[PDB]
């Protein structure tokens, strides 16, 4: 029979396992025989500190680099505010050891765990790159709990060497299988920020992860948006239980917050998944997620049903993390197809926006050809559009199967005039739904104001498989 | 401003 970590603060993890089921059900998958032997995981950020008691026995260099001074040694820079704690907590939601008297235990707490110290400086496009980059042939998982400014008025993602590096990682990475990255949504709740207007959040090529408090509500700090595909626990008010974890300068810490907490649990999930099926490739990672995470009483507004039965929010996607089913699904999974592409012009002629405008297309996908979809995964709508005030603008995107995804929220500050220049919005929305048929896009101006512009590029563009 | 934040 299993016997659960000693450790001494494993009783207050109350995320891992319980009886009143508000858990990630890992004991269900650590029982099962799984805690993450063999799998490697790298955390991306501000260093990592080598020598904690609850990481040395974990620790691989192999999966570790300082880019910021360009050296091997990722050891966090000391300062009198711990400013450089950041990347030590999020190690030890992963892989912090077990059975040893020392703070808690990580969720794959037998895996192998490093860090890319490069938040520590000026974070330029190289330096990202670099990082994404690092020993994909040894490297499994990518965790980064970082990204553009949530001020609620940034249009931004990943340059030209950085979204290279992703195209190689899914390619080339883990021996052809392809490099697995997971990334926080976003921090920005209360500035209204929307986690489609992040291109590493909105990329095909990441796992966003959002956040649910323990008594299972929408967070203060949470981003809503259609390219958030499943969530974990975080924290939520002071009555409210938070995230135990390794500190710095060899401590524990009971109070780890935020959307920066939830992506470490994700990746130790996704490692235990690997270790029941190393064979997986990249997007067969996305759809065991899909089709095993639990909506079951988290509370939102925006519950819908879509075109293949499966329940959808804009706070949680298809919902909480589920390790016990993760790694039972996976062990006789099929690999998926090829995947196909299929790009589709939408627009004769310019069209102006005004209070609002509808734009109707019957497609084909692809019949008769060899990029032929009927079984959708990722869609995109890719926009060029002139606006006066960007933030007035709301966008929808409704599919053949009926289902309504949230493009673009409104959002109060962003008063930029610069439009969107093809821009890709994503939804996971219509996952497993034929995409056959009539696709409505739905732009409108969501104040009084008279507002003007140009909507001039509307490409759609659908990934999948036909079996 | 930073370029990215924590
Ligand atoms: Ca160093
Ligand atoms: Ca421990
Ligand atoms: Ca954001
Ligand atoms: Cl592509
Ligand atoms: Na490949
Ligand atoms: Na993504
Ligand atoms: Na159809």
């Known amino acids: 029979v299993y016997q659960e970590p000693t450790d001494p603060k494993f009783p207050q993890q109350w995320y891992l396992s319980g009886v009143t089921q508000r858990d990630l059900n890992v004991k269900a998958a650590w029982a099962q025989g799984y805690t993450g032997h063999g799998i490697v995981v790298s955390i991306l950020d501000d260093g990592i500190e080598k020598n904690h008691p609850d990481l040395a026995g974990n620790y691989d260099p192999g999966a570790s680099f300082d880019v910021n001074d360009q050296d091997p040694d990722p050891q966090p820079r000391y300062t009198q505010m711990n400013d450089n704690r950041h990347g030590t907590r999020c190690a030890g939601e992963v892989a912090a050891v077990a059975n040893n008297g020392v703070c808690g235990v990580g969720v794959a707490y037998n895996a192998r765990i490093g860090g890319v110290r490069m938040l520590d400086g000026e974070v330029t496009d190289a330096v990202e790159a670099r990082s994404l980059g690092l020993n994909p042939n040894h490297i499994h998982i990518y965790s980064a709990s970082w990204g553009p400014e949530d001020d609620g008025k940034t249009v931004d993602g990943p340059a030209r060497l950085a979204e290279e590096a992703f195209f190689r990682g899914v390619s080339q990475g883990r021996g052809g299988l392809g490099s697995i990255f997971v990334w926080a949504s976003g921090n920005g709740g209360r500035e209204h920020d929307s986690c489609n207007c992040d291109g590493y959040t909105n990329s095909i090529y990441t796992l966003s992860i959002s956040s649910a408090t323990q008594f299972g509500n929408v967070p203060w700090y949470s981003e809503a948006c259609s390219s958030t595909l499943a969530t974990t626990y975080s924290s939520g008010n002071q009555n409210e239980k938070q995230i135990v974890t390794t500190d710095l300068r060899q401590k524990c810490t009971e109070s780890h917050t935020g959307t920066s907490a939830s992506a470490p649990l994700a990746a130790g999930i996704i490692a235990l998944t690997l270790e029941a099926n190393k064979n997986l490739t990249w997007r067969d990672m996305q759809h065991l997620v899909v089709q095993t995470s639990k909506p079951a009483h988290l509370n939102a507004n925006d519950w819908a049903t879509n075109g293949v039965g499966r329940k959808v929010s804009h706070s949680y996607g298809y919902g909480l993390l589920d390790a016990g089913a993760m790694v039972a699904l996976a062990q006789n999974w099929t690999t998926v197809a090829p995947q196909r592409k299929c790009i589709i012009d939408i627009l004769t002629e310019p069209k102006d926006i005004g209070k609002r405008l509808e734009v109707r297309k019957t497609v084909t996908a692809c019949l008769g050809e060899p990029n032929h979809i009927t079984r959708l995964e990722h869609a995109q709508a890719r926009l060029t559009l002139s606006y006066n005030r960007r933030g007035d603008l709301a966008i929808h995107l409704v599919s053949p199967m009926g289902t309504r995804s949230t493009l673009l929220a409104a959002r109060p500050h962003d008063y930029s005039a610069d439009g969107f220049n093809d821009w890709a919005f994503m939804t996971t929305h219509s996952w497993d739904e034929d995409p056959s048929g009539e696709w409505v896009l739905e732009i409108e101006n969501t104040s009084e104001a008279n507002n003007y512009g140009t909507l001039t590029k509307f490409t759609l563009v659908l990934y999948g498989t036909a079996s | ?6």
């Open chain 2, 1 to 6: 401003r930073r370029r990215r934040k924590r």
